Structure formats: structure tokens, C-alpha cells
Design a protein around this ligand. Structure first.
Ligand SMILES: CCc1cc(C(=O)Nc2ccn3nc(-c4ccccc4)nc3c2)cc(Cl)n1
Ligand SMILES: [Mg+2]
Ligand SMILES: [Zn+2]
Length: 313
């Protein structure tokens, strides 16, 4: 009850910043997550024993893939922590509870393959979930783990509060399907510009949380350059393995996933910054002004990819 997690001084200070990198010491990541729940939510939000058991079963259900792994889960949860801590009074008690868990769980049991690849392979998951295939699976794995004996971290919530938190988690996890991000961001653009955006309107809050989820999910482009550039290698290690698997089904993959087209990566990163990342953080910054550092860091990385193209690195 009187038992805080504390971090060494460098981590205690830097964990508060958006560009924080959780480090290569896997055994410190559970403690970093508990630290973030305790400061974001409270020491009372969850029974410590249940939370620790939940975290460790979540870890066990992430796979040893190059990018969509336990380190990504915790990294996406830290970006949500930073957003929440910089927007103290905008979010409900249930939202603070749900969103860190949603982020920890958002890629549960990812195999390193896109929704597209599952549909072309004709994976059983693509017949069970026709759109947002992996994201409905991630939500299903989250409910599975919440239902294991001793793993119900929400046990103190009423029936209707429990239903509300699981609904916040479902929508937050579905929103990490980047196919749904383009339309969500356009509606948020129109709503903000015509002044109709209303944070008491639940369907509006849902949209804003969806955009927060995209921003956290993509937060590798908001790190200091050496972190962003080394993370890119892990992202492409998966894309290129998917490319190989498309070639095995007799399908020329898109260039993004074709290892023969490594040379075109810098221009590919430019498209992604310009079509996805910058717009994401720009709209987030308009809605939630204290998230501006995410946008500033993204623009710094865009300018580094521009330097790569110009052979200045
Ligand atoms: C799983 C989602 C995800 C994706 C990315 C990412 O880097 N995306 C993207 C987008 C689009 N192209 N096009 C290319 C490309 C095009 C032609 C030739 C070679 C390459 N390369 C990417 C890379 C970053 C993060 Cl943080 N999460
Ligand atoms: Mg995902
Ligand atoms: Zn993710």
C-alpha cells in the first residue's frame, strides 16, 4: 500500500519527456510501466499483485518479432503516459485506467504481418474478423488475459464502469488500425476548423482518443534521431519478411516490403512523414496543445531523412 516504484535519477527525469527511450534492459520495463500507472492513475487504481500478474501474462503473449514486440507495447504505453501527464485535467478516471492498459495490450500476439498479408494468406483470423483483423484479435487476447484467475485488475469497478473501461480499450485498440486513421483525422480536422469539436460529446472524445492511439503507436518517429533511425531497421526487418512471404504466395509485394528496393527507403520515409506522421501530430497539437513536442520531434526526424536523401548522411 505504502510501496512506490522509484527509478534511478536519469530515468525518473527523462521518463516525463515525450522522446524517452525505455532502454535495452527488458527486466526494467514492467517496473517502468507500474511507475507510469502509479503517477498517471494513482497507487490505488490497481491491486499491485493483480497488476504484476496481468503485466507478466501480457509480456508472455507478445512474440519475439523484430518490431511488434513487448518493447513496442511498453514504448506505446510511455507515449500515452506523456500525453496524459501533460493534459492533467482533460481525462476521466476510467480513461486514465483504460488507456495505459489499452496501449500495453494494443498489439498482443502480433505475428509481424499486416492485415493485408493475413487476407492474402487466407489466415483463419481473416475469416473470423473481416476488417481490422489483427486489432480485433489484440482486443480478444486482452479480454482472454483479463479473465485468467487473479488477472482482473478492474475487479473493484461496478458492472457498468467495467463495461465502459472495456469499451474505451476496444475502441482504442481498433483505432491503431492505420487504415482507419486517415478518415478519423479528416473528421477531426473539419470539426476543429468549423469549431464543432466538443469534448463532452462522447463520439468526439472517442475520435480524439483514436488519434492519441495513432500518435502513441507511431511514436518511434518522435524519438531522437539515433533511436528513430535504429527502430526503422526493426520496422523494415518485418516489412521485408512480409515481402518475402508475399513472393512465396506468388504476389509481387509493394516496394515498402521488397528488400530488393532498400535504396528507395529514404523517399518512402519522406512519404510516410508527409502523408501520416506530420498530419497526425499537427492535428493532435491543435486539439491538445501540450503535445507539441511530439510534432517538433517528428519534424526534426523528417529533416534528418531529407539529409539522408541529399547524401549528407
Ligand atoms: C506498423 C506501422 C508503422 C509504419 C511505419 C513506417 O515507416 N511506414 C512506412 C509507410 C510507407 N512507406 N513506404 C516506404 C517505401 C516506399 C517505396 C520504397 C521503399 C520504401 N517505406 C514506408 C514506411 C512507422 C511506424 Cl512507427 N509504424
Ligand atoms: Mg497494431
Ligand atoms: Zn502498434
Amino acid at each position: 500500500g505504502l510501496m512506490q516504484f522509484t527509478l534511478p535519477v536519469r530515468l525518473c527525469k527523462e521518463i516525463e519527456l515525450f522522446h524517452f527511450d525505455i532502454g535495452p534492459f527488458e527486466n526494467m520495463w514492467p517496473g517502468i510501466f507500474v511507475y507510469m500507472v502509479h503517477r498517471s492513475c494513482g497507487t490505488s487504481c490497481f491491486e499491485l499483485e493483480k497488476l504484476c500478474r496481468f503485466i507478466m501474462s501480457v509480456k508472455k503473449n507478445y512474440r519475439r518479432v523484430p518490431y511488434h514486440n513487448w518493447k513496442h507495447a511498453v514504448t506505446v504505453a510511455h507515449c500515452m503516459y506523456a500525453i496524459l501527464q501533460n493534459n492533467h485535467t482533460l481525462f476521466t478516471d476510467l480513461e486514465r485506467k483504460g488507456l495505459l492498459i489499452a496501449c500495453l495490450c494494443h498489439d498482443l500476439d502480433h505475428r509481424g504481418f499486416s492485415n493485408s498479408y493475413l487476407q492474402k494468406f487466407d489466415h483463419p483470423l481473416a475469416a473470423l474478423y473481416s476488417t481490422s483483423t489483427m486489432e480485433q484479435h489484440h482486443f480478444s487476447q486482452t479480454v482472454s488475459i483479463l479473465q485468467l484467475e487473479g488477472h482482473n485488475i478492474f475487479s473493484t469497478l461496478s458492472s457498468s464502469e467495467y463495461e465502459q473501461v472495456l469499451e474505451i480499450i476496444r475502441k482504442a485498440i481498433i483505432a491503431t488500425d492505420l487504415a482507419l486513421y486517415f478518415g478519423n483525422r479528416k473528421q477531426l480536422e473539419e470539426m476543429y476548423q468549423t469549431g464543432s469539436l466538443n469534448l463532452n460529446n462522447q463520439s468526439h472524445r472517442d475520435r480524439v482518443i483514436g488519434l492519441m492511439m495513432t500518435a502513441c503507436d507511431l511514436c518511434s518517429v518522435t524519438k531522437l534521431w539515433p533511436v528513430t533511425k535504429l527502430t526503422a531497421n526493426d520496422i523494415y526487418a518485418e516489412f521485408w519478411a512480409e515481402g518475402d512471404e508475399m513472393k512465396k504466395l506468388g504476389i509481387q509485394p509493394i516496394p515498402m516490403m521488397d528488400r530488393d528496393k532498400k535504396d528507395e527507403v529514404p523517399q518512402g520515409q519522406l512519404g510516410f512523414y508527409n502523408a501520416v506522421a506530420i498530419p497526425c501530430y499537427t492535428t493532435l497539437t491543435q486539439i491538445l496543445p501540450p503535445t507539441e513536442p511530439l510534432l517538433k520531434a517528428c519534424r526534426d526526424n523528417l529533416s534528418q531523412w531529407e539529409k539522408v536523401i541529399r547524401g549528407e548522411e
